[PDB]
Design a binder for this molecule. Structure first.
Ligand SMILES: [Mg+2]
Ligand SMILES: [Zn+2]
Ligand SMILES: [Zn+2]
Lengths: 1144, 69
DNA sequence: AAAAAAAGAGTTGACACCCGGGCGAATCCCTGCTATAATGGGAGCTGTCACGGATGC
DNA sequence: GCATCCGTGAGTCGAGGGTAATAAGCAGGGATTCGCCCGGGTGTCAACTCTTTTTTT
């Protein structure tokens, strides 16, 4: 095992200790015989033998001994795995500077000894000469004589007391002569008692880097490395491809070039070449060294044969082969398959069809184990032969093994957590994976060409864990909001709507039926129609006991689906009186699941699906040409509008005429024909016999809400309005036509323009949604419910949204699911309707909604002040299940997934607006808040800006005479969040951000709970600044746990002096992971260059607490099952310690 | 063949139930299942069905299994 | 009621042979030496923003 | 205190299958490498002597 991963600078001694031998010859392999070389990159003596238990030269190939070493050959006998864990080092004749600590964004070497980055580049390139150790003569230290005349002509002051060096040796000597304690003590005194105008910005960074280099234990001279280690000969393979043509990695080229340049420099130093040639050799060697690491900072190094740039070690870990999505996080998985999906109505809700071909391959080891235990086979090898020939007896074993083993099915674009749902496989013919019609709505994938992957859990614990945690029957409620996701999409809802409709004119009306069997028998004979006014006997059980089966007057279509409803109060035949709209049927599944259990809900959803399909297949839902009708008044409305628009053209300013003639004549005419066709379609025709002939197909499809809409029907039968050009404005030409009649090419060109614009818009906005989802998951990945109760009494006020005289969201729906912070009092009447701290159930919800009440203080995750993590007493009721959230459940990941789910359908607001709001950047130049009170004083005397107005006791929209108070919204739209949090409290900024995000998400018509936004806002604010110099002279931001831990320790050391308090600081979600504690979580999403070089000098040790670290290391995630197992291990360790204490 | 409704009602954690059922199945793999019949069921399903009519506070054995080395 | 031998062990010479280690021989790699006069180099963007930061007077 | 210039980002699963160009010469001496063959340790067999479990007397 291993814990507390630590990363820091590697000294030359450590590099020599890691290496086994030094490479001197750049010879990969021989051309006649393919074997390793003596000192080449691929050496057996340095990187172990190539074969397993077989040394070279055919002397100790017996493989019986592993500790012997071949004398003549020179390599020991060892497995091939040792060739991957052996490294080599390269000796350098001259020192070279690291490319990461030189060309990075913050100049690490320039921060030391106050050296500009422009001057260090001149010394490394051997252009100028730096002077050190100055005497009484001129040319003081750090002179940096540029011209050579100053090095020779100006050097006429004696050959002593004057030292000048050039190249990497100068930087090495400067880093070796620099001191840490003296510089830190000098910077500490200068920081205190200083104006702090511009010198502080560099002094703080210098003090930080010095204190990091001091406590970390890394000397400053390790930056200029002297020896470079080589990767083992297993990550840069040279496997021969088919045909005799080898294929090596691009890493061998860099090492070969470095070795060649080093050998050339060594030969130059021995031959005593001139300084001009030796200098160029050192320059080329240093360039090769600092290009072998990054290859992007300096000039690009491209091979002469291939036209693509070489991939160095830095570029190999950034986006392509790094731990982002290639190897660490996202990797290939076996025991899986892929195939197209189809719809199956006979299958249950928890059963999915699986082809025999895929099941036979995925469950091969299970079939082998069954054949071994059943006794029908003998040797394992023999068994492998039985399934190969596909004997008929193996089919019985496959059906027995696949009985309760759940398989995981997931679509390609896994947006939300519902994309992965386990099922029970059932053998079926064909090659298409069967699926359930109700479960397809959760995956968000049509059956046109989509394909789904299948996985198989091998472990017994993982198999049993997916049955009670990831089964499709358990995922019936959406995690974003409490809305059922098993609502009928297209056909079941249409059938239920067709059955719910009641017509007064029908045969067999007025008769009384006791049982539904009599109704069915009458319908079989044809005496009674499908739906007509009928009084029958039905039981309701409203008093929670037994009912006398009171007679009810409803059509035969009604009370046939109502019989499937479970027996329970608050539900019955009274709820089926509606027209059974899609929204109504969706609301019906919520009440049945809320009142009764989960089994009744799933069984009712299964029963209603078959009835809807059986009823839809019996009626004439066929869409025809006569179903769509155009209003007869449109032919006159369009001609009247054309005649009216003619007079406007002859009158004409052309801009005003063209603008007013198109938004008044065509806009009013477009809405007139729309309502005309709507009234003509909604009208119920009366047949001569006296009964309704039939209902329109498109009208029913639009009213049910399954597929049809208002705009679609309007464009199909109406006038289509006016099209918009790609510039943005609307064309003045009237497109008066519909899809039923012919369309000329001119009016079709504008429609094509609009369609192409929409298609190009929808293709780019979806990538931004994925980027935002990937960015939000990394900032809220550390939020896990660890504690049950926190004991916090604080809370945030919650109010309902209102626009004018109507409310958008009810107060009961917004406050529902959260624990009440304080006891709410009934307005007017002195009665306590809710206790101080109690769970707000549906009964309490509609009780608070019935009696009018103002905002109530409710506990939230943002007001919690518990330990690391989040408690269950502030999150509230879970959204996936009715019961409260359990301990160990990941809240940040589900919140990020729910925030990213409604994306790709948005748009001054929308997706870019949400991305800018979450980042908390500068929206635009807005008036700063006055943050004053009482009398307001003038600002600045026209100094290009108004800094602040003091009252001790640009376009301006507020008068100086009027009084100003703290919190006045003297600002244009889109105010800045930084000054808002600086002046007002954190609760105000949180409420403002929540309101903005909720408005941006509701403008499109997507409901989202404010709990996820509150969790994201809490994850944003985690650092606090420092204003007092007590125990910490720095002013930079720090994690919230350090002052809570440092202030308690500082007060215990000495109460004297002064405390330390500072207001919190806000930062975007992107920078929230920049300064995170664990560098592994930051190196995954952000750039690996700035994260590694910054954490390398400081030497931060990762504790493997976050979820991202455990996934990379391959351990149990600290969430849910992992959290419970860790708690059990902790209690077991405590019990063991208690038992060992008594035993001494 | 059995829902997790009664299982969640017995243990509201919904996470310890998985470990408890896994331990119950590991114990039923050899010399167990004297409380509820198989009824043509596998180990995990039979363990989940037995948990609905068994003592939920049986994690003492699971804790003692990893108590010492 | 008695009493010795084909196997079962145990060797004893009698080949058959199969890579190992030398003796050769045939042949690879390195290195340097050539004497009219040779005297500064060829792509590559340039049809995304936007942010977030690093230099300068 | 601002104006100008250099790093990061861009979803995700699937298909599709291999590649490609320049080109001095010869003389000295060693290290390397492939063929044959004697050979001593490893196998594969004719063929000479104690023991004994009965099967026969
Ligand atoms: Mg599709
Ligand atoms: Zn060897
Ligand atoms: Zn709390």
């Amino acid at each position: 095992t291993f814990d507390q991963i630590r990363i820091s600078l590697a000294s030359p001694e450590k590099i020599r200790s890691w290496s086994f031998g030094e490479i001197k010859k750049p010879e990969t392999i021989n051309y006649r015989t393919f074997k390793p070389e003596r000192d080449g990159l691929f050496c057996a003596r340095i990187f172990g033998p190539t074969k397993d238990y077989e040394c070279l030269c055919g002397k100790y190939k017996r493989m019986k001994y592993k500790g012997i070493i071949c004398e003549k050959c020179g390599v020991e006998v060892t497995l091939a795995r040792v060739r991957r864990e052996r490294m080599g080092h390269i000796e350098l004749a001259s020192p070279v500077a690291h490319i990461w600590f030189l060309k990075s964004l913050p100049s690490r070497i320039a921060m030391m000894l106050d050296m500009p980055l422009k001057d260090i580049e001149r010394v490394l390139y051997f252009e100028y000469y730096i002077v050190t150790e100055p005497g009484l003569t001129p040319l003081k230290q750090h002179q940096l004589l540029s011209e050579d005349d100053y090095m020779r002509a100006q050097e006429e002051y004696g050959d002593d007391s004057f030292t000048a060096e050039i190249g990497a040796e100068a930087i090495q000597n400067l880093l070796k002569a620099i001191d840490l304690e003296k510089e830190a003590e000098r910077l500490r005194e200068e920081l205190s008692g200083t104006v702090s105008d511009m010198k502080q910005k560099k002094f703080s960074k210098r003090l930080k880097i010095l204190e990091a280099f001091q406590e970390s234990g890394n000397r400053p001279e390790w930056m200029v490395l002297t020896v470079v280690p080589v990767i083992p000969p297993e990550l840069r393979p040279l496997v021969p491809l088919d045909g005799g043509r080898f294929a090596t990695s691009d890493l061998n080229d860099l090492y070969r070039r470095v070795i060649n340049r080093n050998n050339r420099l060594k030969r130059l130093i021995e031959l005593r070449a001139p300084d001009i040639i030796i200098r160029n050799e050192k320059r080329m060697l240093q360039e090769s060294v600092d290009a072998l690491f990054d290859n992007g900072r300096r000039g690009r190094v491209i091979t002469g044969a291939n036209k693509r740039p070489l991939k160095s070690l830095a570029d190999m870990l950034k986006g392509k082969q790094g731990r982002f999505r290639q190897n660490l996080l996202g990797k290939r998985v076996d025991y899986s398959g892929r195939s197209v999906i189809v719809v199956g109505p006979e299958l249950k809700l928890h059963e999915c069809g699986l082809p025999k071909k895929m099941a036979l391959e995925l469950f091969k080891p299970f079939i082998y184990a069954r054949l071994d235990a059943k006794g029908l086979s003998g040797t394992v090898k023999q068994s492998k032969r039985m399934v190969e020939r596909e004997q008929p007896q193996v089919w019985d074993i496959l059906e027995e093994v696949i009985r309760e083993h759940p398989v995981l099915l997931n679509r390609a674009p896994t947006l939300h957590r519902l994309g992965i749902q386990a099922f029970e496989p059932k053998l079926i013919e064909g090659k298409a994976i069967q699926l359930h019609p109700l479960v397809c709505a959760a995956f968000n994938a049509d059956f046109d060409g989509d394909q789904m992957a299948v996985h198989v859990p091998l472990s017994l614990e993982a198999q049993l864990e997916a049955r009670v945690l990831m089964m499709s029957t358990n995922n019936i409620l959406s995690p974003a909001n409490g809305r059922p996701i098993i609502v009928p999409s297209q056909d079941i809802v249409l059938g239920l709507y067709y059955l719910s409709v009641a017509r007064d004119g029908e045969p067999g009306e007025g008769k009384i039926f006791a049982d539904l069997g009599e109704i069915e028998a009458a319908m079989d004979a044809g005496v009674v129609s499908l739906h007509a006014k009928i009084k029958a006997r039905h039981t309701e059980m409203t008093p929670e006991g037994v009912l006398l089966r009171k007679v009810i007057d409803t059509t035969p279509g009604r009370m046939k689906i109502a019989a499937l409803l479970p027996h329970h109060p608050q539900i019955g035949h009274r709820l089926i009186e509606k027209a059974l709209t899609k929204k109504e049927i969706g609301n019906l599944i919520d009440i049945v699941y809320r009142h009764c259990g989960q089994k009744a809900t799933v069984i009712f959803a299964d029963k209603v699906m078959g009835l809807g399909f059986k009823e839809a297949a019996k009626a004439g839902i066929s869409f025809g040409k006569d179903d769509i009708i155009i209003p007869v008044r449109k032919t006159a409305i369009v001609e009247e509008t054309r005649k009216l628009a003619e007079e406007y053209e002859q009158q004409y300013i052309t801009k005003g005429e063209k603008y007013n003639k198109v938004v008044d004549a065509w806009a009013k005419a477009t809405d007139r024909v729309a309502d005309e066709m709507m009234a003509e379609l909604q009208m119920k025709h009366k047949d001569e016999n006296g009964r309704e002939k039939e209902i329109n197909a498109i009208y029913m499809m639009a009213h049910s809400g399954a597929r049809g809409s208002q705009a679609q029907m309007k464009q199909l039968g109406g006038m289509r309005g006016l099209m918009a050009k790609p510039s943005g404005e609307i064309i003045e030409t009237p497109i008066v036509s519909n899809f039923k009649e012919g369309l000329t090419v001119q009016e079709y060109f504008n429609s094509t323009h609009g369609a192409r614009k929409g298609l190009a818009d929808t293709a780019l906005k979806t990538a931004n949604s994925g980027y935002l989802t990937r960015r939000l998951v990394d900032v809220a990945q550390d939020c896990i419910i660890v504690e049950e109760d926190c004991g916090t009494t604080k809370g945030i006020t919650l109010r309902a949204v209102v626009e004018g005289g109507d409310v958008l969201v009810s107060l009961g729906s917004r406050v529902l699911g959260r624990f009440t912070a304080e006891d709410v009092k009934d307005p007017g009447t002195g009665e306590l309707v809710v206790p101080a701290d109690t769970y707000i159930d549906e009964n309490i919800a509609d009780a608070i909604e019935a009696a009018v009440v103002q905002s109530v203080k409710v506990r939230s995750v943002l007001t919690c002040e518990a330990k690391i993590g989040v408690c269950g007493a502030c999150y509230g009721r879970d959204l996936a299940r009715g019961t409260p959230v359990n301990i160990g459940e990941a809240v940040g990941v589900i919140a990020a997934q729910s925030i990213g789910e409604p994306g790709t359908q948005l748009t001054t607001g929308g997706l870019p607006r949400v991305a800018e709001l979450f980042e908390a950047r500068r929206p635009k130049d807005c008036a700063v808040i006055a943050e004053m009170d009482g009398r307001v004083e003038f600002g600045k005397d026209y100094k290009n800006k108004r800094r602040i107005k003091i009252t001790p006791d640009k376009h301006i929209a507020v008068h100086d005479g009027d009084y100003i108070t703290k919190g006045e919204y003297i600002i244009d739209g889109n105010p800045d969040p930084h000054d808002i949090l600086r002046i007002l409290g954190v609760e105000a900024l949180a409420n403002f951000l929540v309101d903005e995000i909720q408005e941006v998400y509701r403008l499109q018509g997507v409901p989202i709970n404010d709990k996820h936004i509150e969790t994201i806002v809490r994850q944003m604010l985690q650092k606090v600044e420092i204003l007092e110099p007590g125990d910490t002279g720095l002013i930079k931001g720090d994690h919230l746990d350090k002052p809570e831990f440092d202030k308690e320790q500082e007060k215990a050391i000495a109460r004297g002096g002064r405390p330390a308090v500072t207001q919190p600081v806000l930062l975007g979600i992107t920078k929230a992971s920049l300064q995170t504690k664990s560098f592994i979580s930051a190196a995954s999403f952000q750039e690996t260059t700035r994260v590694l070089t910054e954490a390398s000098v400081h030497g931060k040790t990762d504790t493997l607490e976050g979820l991202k670290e455990n996934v990379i290391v391959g351990r149990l995630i600290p969430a849910g099952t992992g959290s419970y197992l860790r708690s059990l291990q902790r209690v077991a360790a405590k019990r063991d310690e208690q038992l060992a204490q008594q035993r001494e | 063949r059995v829902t997790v409704e009664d299982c969640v009602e017995k243990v509201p954690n919904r996470f310890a139930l998985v470990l408890l059922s896994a331990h119950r199945a590991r114990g039923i793999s050899a010399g167990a299942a004297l409380m509820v019949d198989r009824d043509n069921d596998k180990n995990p399903v039979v363990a989940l069905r037995e948990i609905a009519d068994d003592v939920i506070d049986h994690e003492g054995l699971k804790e003692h299994l990893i108590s010492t080395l």
